[PDB]
Write a protein that binds this ligand. Sequence first.
Ligand code: HEC
Length: 81
Amino acid sequence: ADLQDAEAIYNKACTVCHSMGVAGAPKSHNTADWEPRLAKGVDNLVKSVKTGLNAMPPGGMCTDCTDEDYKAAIEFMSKAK
Ligand code: HEC
């Protein structure tokens, strides 16, 4: 839609599952949900999201979304998933 704000990207996109924790989704704010992700790194997730997990659409429900906004959307929450 528009990647003018990393907040607006997660709050428009990662806002159906991760907001409340639906479809078994990992919480928008956690430490133990993010710990096992921050063990390997960060980008390891930006690839998974752009790829689409099982319950996730291929491309994190995005289209023209650049790593700057994508990573910023992940890092808004913490710095991993
Ligand atoms: C449902 C409609 C989802 C939307 C929209 C997004 N995500 Fe998601 N995510 C969802 C589920 C059910 C899960 C599975 C949890 C698991 O067991 O792996 C996830 C997982 C992720 C992960 C991986 C977490 C892990 O521990 O491996 C990441 C990195 C992640 N999701 C990021 C992410 C972002 C940034 C999204 C918006 C661009 C997004 N997800 C949308 C369900 C859904």
